[PDB]
Every structure is written in C-alpha cells, then in structure tokens.
Design a protein around this nucleic acid. Structure first.
Ligand SMILES: Cc1cn([C@H]2C[C@H](O)[C@@H](COP(=O)(O)OP(=O)(O)OP(=O)(O)O)O2)c(=O)[nH]c1=O
Ligand code: SF4
Ligand SMILES: [Zn+2]
Lengths: 763, 249, 66, 251
DNA sequence: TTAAGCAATTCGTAATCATGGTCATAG
DNA sequence: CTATGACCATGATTACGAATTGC
C-alpha cells in the first residue's frame, strides 16, 4: 500500500476542514493539503491508525471501501507484523475482524459482502446505497459521476520515478477521495436516512443491512403496547398463491384524438383504511354465530371473509398507514415549491421512498415466507381493487353519451389496475381537460373516504402497442403547451439492449410524434442501417450488458454473459465478474450459428485484439423487430415492405494467420479494376481525373476536422495543456473514438499519395 | 459488356455449392483472361481462390473489366433453378448493376434470371508465392471421407507428413484415432516430401473445403512448416478452386 | 543490462526535457540538445552500442492504447 | 490381450446400429468362446443378448477374459468411420482401460486406428430363465419391420394373436384401428408357424421398432411367444452368432 | 438465523417433426 | 443399365427458462 488520502468535514459547513495525504516516498508540496512521507510501510499504517484515533470521526464513507479497502489494509498489516494497527474502534481493548455476510430478496436480488467491525462508528459505502436505491446501466464511479455530475501498471512506474510524478499521483488520489463526499451531500442521502430512522423507529445501521420487515415489525410493536396485545408466532411452509390484479383488454393502435387519464391515488393503503381491515379485527367464520347482527357491525368481501365495522374496533394497520400517508403528504407539500430540476427529482425520490414503505406494509401480509402472514387480507384487497376498476369503466362509458345531452359517447381504450385511459372524442385539449376534470370529480363521489379519483394528464397523440407497452405526449395545462414524451415499457427504457437501438427508437418517436413526418423517419432509419453496414458506427453503441445472478439458474441453461464471465483471462485470474454485478460484451462474427454464446467477447479485448463485428446479427436480431413493432400500426403491411425495401435499396452497400501473407493488389479509384502498376486511375477512366481528385479531398478535409476536435478535448478533461493524456476510461465515448480517426486519417492520407505531389519540397 | 457461354453449366452449379457455405458476399473479377474470385471466409481463417479461364468457356467475351460484389447465397439459390444439363450464360452490362443468368435447356425452354449486384469494399489479400515441403495427391472422395470420419473424434486434425506416407489424427471425449495413407489412376496416392511436416487444422473448415469434391476426382494438399495449408481442386480445362487454411498455433 | 534499463526509464520521466510519449527516444534526445537544455552524455552512449531493439529505442508506454 | 479380426466388418457396424438407440452403456464380455453382451434397455422393459462366436471371426484370440464397459454411442460414432468393406480388428490390453478399433481398407493403402476409452460400469446383471414357447413365428425381417412400422401409425401397442392357421397383429387409436394377418405358406420369403397353444399378448410398438434396427443383419427373424412371459425377437448373424431382444409384455 | 407482493412480455437454446438428395441394389 | 424406397442431411415448430419492467 503506497498512498492513503483523507478528507474530513463537520456537517453543515459548505467546505471541508481537513485534507491530508500520506505517501511512501518523498514527495512535492500541494497547496491546500498537508503532505508527510515515510521510508517504510509500517510507519504509514501506524500514522493512519493514530490519525484515525485522534480525529475520532462519527461517520466513515468512501466508494467500495467494504469489499476492497479495509480488508486489504487489515491483511497487509497482518503480513508485516505490526501489532497495533487493527484497533480502529472506540473501545480501547478491542481488535477488528473480517466477516462474510449475504443478503437476498426478490426486490434487489442477492449480494455477498464482507463486514469489518467498528464499535461506536458508522459506515456508509456509497456503492451499496447506489446499488440498493437506483437502477442504472453501469455502476462505476466514472459512470455515476457522469450521470449525476458530468465527467494499475502505469501507477507502478509513476511511483518508481521522481517526486513530481508522485505529486501527480497524490492529486489524482485526492480527487478520487473527494468525489463521494460531493455525491453524499448533493443527493440528500444522509438527511433522508435520518428522516427514515425517525419515522420508522429503527437504528441508523439497519438501513444499510436489512430489508423492509424490521421496520413494519417495529411500528406494529410500537402501536401494540398502547392497547395491550401480544403478537403470536405463526409459521407455515407453505401456502398457495392468490389472484392478483386485472388488466383491461386494449383497443390497440395509433390514436390522434385526445385520451384523458383518471386514476386513484394511494389505492391499496386506502382500501385497507376505509373498510377497517386488520389482523386484530378479522372475524373467524364461526364467531359471528350465533349472534345475528350483520348490519353495521360487519361487512363482507368478494373473496368471502367477514370484517367488523369501525363502531366496535379500530385496527392497527389503518393507524400505521395514516401516519405514513401524512409523512408523504408533507414531503410532497415541501416538493411543490422547488425550482431546481435535480433538487425536484431528489425530493421526488424522498416521496417515492415513503410511498414504497406504505405499500410494503400491505405486502407484509401476503408473504408466506416471513414473520406473520394473513393471506385472507391480501385476497380482500385485490378483490376490492378489481371491483372498483370495473365500476370505474362501467360508469365512465355509461354516463357521457349522445342521448344524455353530451357530444359523443366515450369509449375506454385501456385500464391497468389503478388507471383508466378514456377517449372522449373532442380534438381540443381545453375541452378534453374540462370534461376529464368533471369526470374525475364526478366518479369520486361513490365511495368511502379517503378514496378519490383524480385527473392526471391528456395524451395527444397516443400509441398503444400491447399490454404494458405504450407511448404518448404529455400535457399538464393548456398554456403550458407540452412537457415531454412518455415511453412506458418500450425499447428505450430497458437495459437489455444496445444504445444504438434505444437511440433509434427515441429518435423515431421524436420525428414521428412531434414533427409528424414519416419520410424523415424512414430516411433516418435508412441512414442508421446504411452506416451500420458501411462500418462507421462506434463500438460504444454496440455494447450489451447483463446481470450475473445466482450461479445455479445460470447452470440450468447456457447464456452468453455467463460464458464470458466464467471464461477467465490469461492476464488476470483475479479480476473477473462476481455474483450480482453486470457483465458487458459485444458479439463478433463467426460461423457457429447454433450458438450466440460462442461469439461474445469483452469490449477491451476486442479493442486490443481487433476482432470484426457481426453486422447481420445486429441487423436482424437487435434492430429489426422493435422497428416492426413501432412502424406497422400507422400503415398496413406495405409498411413492413417499405422498411424492408428501404433496407433493400441500402442493403446493397456493404464495406469489407493467413492475414499476414498479403499481396496488396492496387485498384482503380474509378471502376475498381485490379491492375499492374501504382497509378490511381484506370486507362479507360482517365479523362475524368480532376473530378476524381476533387472527390475524396473533401473527405480528407472532414477527417482532419474530426482529429482536432477530439484530441484537444482530452486536454481539457484532463486539466493540463503541457503534459501527456493517460485516460483509458471504458465508460467514455472519447476513448476508442479517438483511436479510430488516427487510422482513418492514416488510410485516407496514403490514398492521395497515389496522385503525385503538388510541388517540390527541397528548394 | 460481359458475356460467357458455359455448356457444362453443372460446373457453375458445383462451384457455388462449394463457396456459398464458406462465403456470403464475394467479388468476381471478370476480364479477357477469364473469371476469377479471391476472398477470405467469414471467419477470416481461410482464403478461396477461384479461376475460370476463358478458354474453358465455349464462348467468352469481355469488353470492359467489370467486377460486381455478388451475394453468393442469392447466386446459389438462383443457380439451383438450372438443370444439371442446361447451357448457362453469364451476361453483364458495364453500366448495369445487375448480372444475368440465362439457362438454355438442351432440347423449348429458356430461363432468364437477372441478379442484383452490390457494392462491396471487400478486404483484398495477396498470397505470397511460396514453396511446399509436401504435396499429397489423392482421390477427393477419400479426402472428404477422412475429414468426415475424424470430425466425429475431435474438432482439429493433425496432418503429419513423413517420407513413406501421410497421417491424419484427432482426439476428444470418446478417445482418439488416426488414418494412414501410403504411396502406391485417380485412385492412387502420391506424395512429395522434401521435409517432414506436422500441422494442426480445424476439421470444421476442411469440411467446408470438401463441398468442392464433386468438381474433381482428385485433390492435392500442399503443406509446409508454419504456413497456410493449400487444398486445391482442378476444374478440368476451366481452371481451379484453391482453399488456403491458416493452421492452429 | 538491468541497470541500463533504469537509466532510460529515468530519462523518460524527467520533466525538463519534454512531454514525450508520442515519439522515439533518440528524437527527444536530439530535440533537447538543439535547444540545449542539458541532455546527459550517457543516455546517448547506450543508444549507440545497440541495434534497433524495441526495448531500448522506444518510449515506456509505446504499447498502451493511449 | 484380446485380438479379433473380422473381415465382414459391416457386421459390426450393423450390430451397433441395432444397439445404440436402445442401449447407452453396455458391457462386452470377451473370452475364448467369443464376444457376448447382455443388457436391459434404458427403460428396463427389454433385454438384448448379443452372441459373436470366435468361430465366425477370421482370427480370434483372447488371453485374459475381458469385461469392457463400452459406451455404445461412442463406439457407434467411431464405427461409422469404417467403410462397409474394411477389415475391422478389435484389440485390447488386459491392463489398458481402452479398446482399439483398426480398420483396413481392402486395397490396403489406408489404415484407420481408433482407440476408444472404456469405462467402469456396475451394470445390473439379469438371468434369463430358460423356457419353452407356445408359438414360434419365422418370417422375413423386412415384412416384420414393415408390420411394426405400419401399426405404429394406428396406435402405441400391438396385440399379437397367434392361432393354429396363422398369426395376427393389431392396434387401435384416434384414427380407428387395423390389423395384419400372416398365414403359413407351402426360403426367406415364407412364413412358418409352430403353435402348441394359441397365444395373445400386448407389446409396445415403440420397442418393437427398436428391435427392427437389426433388420439389416438377417433376411429372416423368428418371434417366440408364450402366455405371460417376455416375447423373444431374434435375428441370426450367419456363422457369427445372433442378436436376441426380449420385450416384457403389457399386463 | 434471514428474506414486501403479482401480471406480463420478450428472446435464445435444445428438442421434435417435415422434407429432399444421394445411393444401393434388385429387375 | 435402370425404378424403388431406405438412408443421411438440413430446415420449420413447439416448449420452457431467464431477464426485466409495470402496477
Ligand atoms: C408500485 C407498486 C404498486 N402497488 C400497488 C399498490 C398500489 O395501491 C397500486 C397502485 O400502484 P401505484 O400507482 O404505482 O402507487 P399508488 O397508487 O399507491 O400511489 P400514487 O398514485 O400517488 O403514485 O399498486 C404495490 O403493491 N407495490 C408496488 O411496488
Ligand atoms: S478519453 Fe478523453 S474525453 Fe474521454 S474520459 Fe478520457 S480524458 Fe476525458
Ligand atoms: Zn478504371
């Protein structure tokens, strides 16, 4: 271990107050930080342990400190025989130890971590907070720093060199150690963790280790001491499933008359609230008998149970849910007065977390592997849901009709278990908004409270492909003209595909829904396919990522990413994907057509070893079928022939051990006839040579302009204008797009030396 | 304007059945000398060299040296619409991006097919004219069988050529085996060993090369230390078809 | 050898001769001599008692796709 | 050290083509008497008995009695690398856990040598109760094969009814039912029947169809039935020995 | 000792089933 | 030297698991 670098601050002050860097050879001074140097590693580990005792911090953060940093330090101190290192905690006579742990759920998957013991102090690895809350494409520090802010063997010779190289290494390490602080204070992590621990009543270490059961157990016990009840222990392996939610059958297609969306807000917690459903008021089938009082003492549910009215008991789950609902309402009332966009979405994150907590209260009941299940309640909930949504659809389509004085009889096109997308008939967004608000407020008056239906949007135009797949354009007000698109479910929000395909789907829906020009859309898709086949598409747009889950399900059937991961490298059998992460790969061309798991390769390996790409795989398996989903419903099946013919005019333009034994046959630039001698033009195509020189110097001119815009961008992203660039960042498009233009220019410069020189040079 | 008349059209059929599975898109260099084609395979592990001399054709004619990137799969499909006895006629227009295939039945029927050409910027390679330590001539059928047999034992074949004879061998899950040929008209095996050689090749590709068996009674194998194996089938008076396979290192 | 391979690795990272990871080693030695910054006469006397070896006459990172 | 030379090697090829689909892994008992193999099928519904007498071989030789657990699938694949005219030679080493198959092409300018890996099989041995049969039917193997293929289109099982005059096979299913009747005649084209007692038994055409892969081994096949016992289907391997298939009936 | 629920759509691999090109031998 | 179906080889259909998103 050669350098340790530390940043420290008091919470509430907008800058740090401590900035220290401890190195292992003599170094050069850095303005703003202290620098100390040692000639042996024992002094370095001792100095860090003494600093961490004396400063005595409350919280320790970092990025991947649990699974890399602390056990490396502990094992390295054990090897070098330094006895006083592993006492990092607060208790004076206690040493620390490495211990494995695993967590698994159907919500976050399964992850295996080490833990290191520190008594008194709290740990917050920001990697685990990101991996638990956020669903992203890559989880590298560079990728999340670009997504939120906007950015090994070389180091061994920056350290065996001079002291300005070591000073450069220390400035790099200090920037690395500074980035997670900025992420912690910018994303409102710690304020939301403190508010979660105050609303639920669990400690601050449980929100990084546990799930959503300890919190609902805690709140139920805290509500149970106030009336004098005790909880039982029921455990069963195992019950059966029950029936979930209804989806209404669509009227599929393309709509160009406005559809208004009406939905219920906080549906399942308000069902559980306003019909008095709880553990503590579930009536067994016999204890009603032989009392006969049915009216206003109990009710009956569509699955079949009987539940006591609120004039006898009050349940415990209504009160816990009412507290959580008021907390989320206060968070939304605070969110309704922000102007900054990233701040608006992080308050949206806070309210999303409180709504997830309130819904996991209901999901506690149906978990037959758990601590206290009561599937009768769950069945009553979803039965009430189904009954109310079909009530909504009957009522909306039945009242506003041609005989009832209105304009047109409306017709529901879609509904998915909480929402209803009714198509009204008018093509004026003001009149649709007015009637939709009247409908929402009208239908809501047929229920107990807090059951309320609300207007939410007007889509104009609309595109419905299947169940859980649609798109549209979003209206919030009228003079607020339009907000954005909505892409529910489609190929632009999933992460199982290429960036090329998601970009093409977004650009096609842009040209098709905003400008309403299908001809520019056809020309766009043609240019994408043509530039694919002509081999001028970057390999950033070709990378596919998949998650490496539990190893036995991936034992059960052969996949591509599992095959790439389990195949080690010759260079490194010590850095490879583990369980739970994401494996990136691209597909190269070969002749083993039975298996697409035999053609997958690491992006850096195909970078350094230059393997070709299977353009037919990407053409017929990645691109073609999402396009045939989207482009068909506006036209007939002559549209499938239109895009497969727009392919056909553009499919006829394709660019191209033994490879060393070349002959390098020259070819005519005009008509492609191989011939003896080095002159560029053919003897039949000579009278046309000024035009053939004119052609292709406007190509060299455009490659020259692309070299310079890229190789000076690295100088501004690096910081310095006087020293070399070293950044092989695999998540930057800049890298390997700066590598191919050198070769394009190398090739296009040599093609023009077929022609003579435009003058002498030795004069 | 190109125009070639080939009476034994079955030759053209056999040729495409020998390239189609190895090559998707190729380029044919037509000229007064005859038709020619050279292309790496998909895998970029081998190189095919086709040579159809104008002499072999019963009527050749090439005004402009015109080459069109042909889709061997489409040309293959098209060529299957020809009887093994029809007279085939290739005919192109220096200005048209389409090649024409006309089949004349011996006896009242004429098929005409216009195949769409395409712009191919194929990666050209140059073969380094070299000498070979060993050249083995043998029935093409025997060679074909050998490659099929071994393919059941393992994925690669070690071709060991010594003074007396040549040996092919492989190994896998179900053990291993080897076939030995020794010197002894188109049923005989001749060997020219200047230097014993030993090289490893993928049976998968050798098996592709063998789709050319119906083109010749015999096939010659030319090897040499650390260089591509040469598998060649003569196309009687027309020219030939050569397959170069990079060895495994 | 094994002591001559650290002298060249020390000449390659001294900042007072230039920012050199795109060119050869002897070109940077003559560039500094033209401007006469202070090239030392020992990083020359190992680039003469060798032929065209790629581990003497090349910069440290002449691999490495940067 | 085992070593047998078989000039009509196509015989060995035909044998494996008749066992491979019924048996995955078998044991080959070698001795001075000749090669022998007895094994239940996967399904444990039938038993195959192969007998290759040393006399039939053009050069037999067995020093130590051998038991070769062979994977009939690997041996089958390997055997397909033999021409129907090559001279095949089985050769083993009492100490080596590998069997060697050498094929010599008639001309003799080519020799193939295959070393197949053996395996330790603890196969479940069975003993056939030497018994007598009420009915024995001899008939062309091709006719028998066709009968089994035909009925297979009607149903899954075949009822073989043997009476005085002749024998009858029948089946039924979704698309109706049918039956074929064979009667005695008066060499490899005739049908002979030996009925001591009329018999009726139900068998699965699926297995009978496996037995028929042995058709290319003999011009004729004999069927031996008896009340409540396994049907015997036997194909003679001229001067070599034979191949017997026992199928348990359906009750 | 540890873990909130169900509905639905998409894609890849192996296995099942249809169909033609050679071929091998009886007429 | 020539019909016939048995044999090998290649392509179309179905089934089921894995992955990921919407409520
Ligand atoms: C998202 C989600 C919904 N549901 C159920 C409960 C909800 O009552 C029902 C509706 O889904 P949602 O509309 O997503 O959530 P919501 O209606 O409760 O709150 P809001 O309208 O303010 O966004 O779906 C779950 O059970 N678990 C979940 O994770
Ligand atoms: S390649 Fe250049 S632009 Fe891209 S991340 Fe690295 S330094 Fe920045
Ligand atoms: Zn020209």
């Amino acid at each position: 271990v050669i350098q340790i670098c530390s940043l420290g601050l008091r919470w509430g002050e907008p800058e740090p107050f401590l900035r220290l860097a401890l190195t292992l050879r003599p170094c050069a001074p850095i303005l703003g930080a202290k620098v100390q140097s040692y000639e042996k590693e024992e002094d370095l580990l001792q100095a860090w342990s003494t600093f961490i005792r004396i400063m005595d911090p409350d919280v320790i953060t970092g990025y991947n400190i649990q699974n890399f940093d602390l056990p490396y330090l502990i094992s390295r101190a054990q090897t070098l025989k330094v006895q006083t290192f592993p006492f990092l905690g607060r208790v004076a006579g206690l040493c620390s130890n490495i211990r494995d742990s695993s967590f698994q759920s159907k919500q976050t998957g399964r992850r295996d971590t080490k833990v290191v013991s520190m008594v008194g102090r709290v740990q917050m690895d920001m990697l685990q907070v990101l991996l638990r809350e956020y669903k992203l494409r890559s989880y590298t520090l560079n990728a999340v720093s670009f997504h939120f802010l906007g950015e090994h063997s070389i180091i061994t010779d920056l350290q065996n060199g001079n002291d300005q190289t070591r000073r450069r290494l220390a400035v790099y390490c200090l920037k690395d150690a500074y980035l997670p602080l900025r992420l912690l204070e910018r994303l409102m992590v710690l304020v939301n963790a403190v508010e979660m621990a105050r609303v639920t009543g669990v400690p601050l270490s449980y929100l990084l280790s546990r799930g959503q059961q300890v919190k609902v157990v805690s709140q139920l016990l805290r509500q149970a001491m106030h009336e004098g009840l005790l909880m039982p222990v029921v455990k069963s392996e195992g019950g059966e499933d029950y029936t979930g939610a209804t989806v209404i059958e669509p009227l599929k297609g393309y709509y160009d008359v406005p559809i208004a969306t009406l939905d219920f807000s906080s549906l399942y917690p308000s069902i559980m609230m306003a019909h008095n459903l709880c553990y503590t008021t579930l009536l067994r089938p016999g204890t009603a008998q032989k009392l006969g009082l049915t009216e206003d003492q109990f009710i009956r549910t569509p699955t079949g149970d009987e539940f006591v009215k609120t004039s006898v008991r009050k349940g415990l789950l209504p009160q816990i849910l009412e507290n959580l609902l008021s907390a989320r309402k206060r968070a939304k009332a605070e969110l309704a007065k922000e102007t900054d966009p990233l701040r608006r979405q992080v308050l949206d994150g806070r309210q999303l977390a409180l709504k997830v907590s309130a819904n996991s209260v209901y999901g506690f009941t149906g978990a037959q592997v758990g601590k206290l299940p009561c599937l009768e309640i769950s069945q009553s909930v979803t039965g009430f849901g189904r009954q109310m949504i079909e009530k909504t659809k009957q009522l909306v389509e039945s009242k506003y009709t041609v005989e009832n004085g209105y304009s047109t009889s409306a017709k529901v096109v879609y509904g998915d278990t909480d929402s209803v997308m009714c198509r009204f008939g008018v093509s004026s967004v003001a009149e649709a908004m007015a009637l939709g608000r009247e409908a929402a407020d009208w239908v809501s008056g047929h229920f107990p409270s807090p059951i309320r239906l609300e207007f939410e949007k007007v889509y104009f135009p609309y595109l419905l492909i299947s169940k859980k797949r649609y798109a549209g354009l979003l209206f919030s007000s009228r003079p607020d003209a339009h907000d954005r698109m909505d892409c529910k479910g489609l190929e632009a929000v999933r992460r199982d595909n290429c960036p090329l395909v998601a970009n093409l789907v977004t650009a096609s829906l842009r040209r098709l829904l905003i400008d309403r020009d299908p001809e520019g859309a056809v020309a766009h898709a043609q240019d994408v396919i043509s530039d694919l086949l002509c081999n001028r598409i970057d390999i950033s747009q070709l990378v596919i990522t998949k998650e490496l889950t539990r190893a036995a399900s991936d034992y059960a059937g052969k996949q591509a990413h599992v095959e790439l991961a389990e195949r080690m490298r010759k260079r490194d059998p010590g850095s490879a994907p583990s369980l739970g992460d994401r494996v990136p790969y691209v597909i190269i061309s070969a002749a083993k057509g039975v298996a697409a798991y035999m053609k997958s390769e690491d992006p850096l390996f195909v970078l350094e070893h230059s393997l070709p790409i299977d353009t037919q795989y990407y053409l017929e398996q990645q691109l073609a079928k999402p396009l045939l989903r989207i482009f068909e419903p506006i036209l007939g099946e002559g549209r499938a022939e239109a895009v497969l013919l727009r392919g056909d005019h553009t499919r006829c333009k394709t660019v191209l051990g033994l490879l060393a034994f070349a002959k390098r046959r020259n070819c005519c630039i005009g008509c492609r006839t191989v011939l003896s001698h080095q002159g560029a033009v053919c003897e039949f195509c000579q009278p046309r040579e000024s035009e053939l020189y004119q052609k292709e110097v406007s190509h060299l001119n455009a490659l020259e302009e692309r070299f310079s815009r890229l190789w000076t961008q690295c100088q501004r992203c690096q910081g310095s204008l006087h020293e070399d660039v070293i950044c092989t960042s695999r998540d930057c498009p800049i890298f390997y797009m700066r590598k191919k233009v050198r070769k394009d220019l190398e090739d296009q410069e040599q093609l023009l030396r077929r022609f003579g020189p435009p003058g002498p040079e030795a004069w | 304007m190109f125009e070639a008349r080939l009476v034994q059209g079955s030759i053209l059929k056999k040729v495409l059945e020998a390239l189609k599975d190895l090559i998707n898109e190729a380029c044919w260099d037509i000229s007064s000398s005859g038709v020619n084609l050279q292309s790496m395979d998909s895998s970029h592990v081998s190189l095919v060299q086709l040579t159809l001399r104008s002499e072999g054709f019963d009527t050749y004619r090439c005004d402009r040296n015109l080459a069109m990137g042909v889709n061997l799969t489409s040309m293959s499909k098209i060529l299957k619409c020809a009887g093994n006895e029809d007279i085939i006629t290739l005919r192109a227009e220096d200005n048209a991006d389409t090649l024409a295939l006309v089949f004349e039945a011996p006896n009242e029927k004429v098929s005409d097919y216009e195949m769409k050409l395409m712009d191919l910027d194929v990666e050209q390679l140059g073969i380094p004219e070299q000498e070979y330590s060993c050249v083995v001539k043998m029935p093409s059928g025997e060679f074909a069988r050998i490659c099929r047999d071994l393919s059941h034992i393992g994925d690669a074949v070690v071709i060991s050529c010594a003074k007396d004879g040549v040996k092919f061998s492989a190994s896998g899950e179900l053990g291993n085996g080897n076939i030995k040929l020794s010197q002894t008209e188109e049923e005989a095996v001749t060997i020219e060993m200047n230097e014993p050689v030993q090289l490893t090749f993928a049976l998968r590709y050798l098996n592709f090369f063998t789709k050319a068996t119906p083109l010749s009674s015999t096939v010659t194998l030319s090897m040499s230390a650390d260089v591509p194996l040469v598998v060649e089938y003569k196309i009687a008076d027309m020219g030939h078809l050569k397959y170069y396979l990079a060895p495994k290192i | 050898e094994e002591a001559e391979l650290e002298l060249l690795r020390q000449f390659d990272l001294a900042w007072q001769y230039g920012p050199c990871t795109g060119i050869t080693r002897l070109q940077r030695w003559c560039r500094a001599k033209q401007m006469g910054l202070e090239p030392p006469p020992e990083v020359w006397q190992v680039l003469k008692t060798h032929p065209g070896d790629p581990r003497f006459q090349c910069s440290l990172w002449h691999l490495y796709p940067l």
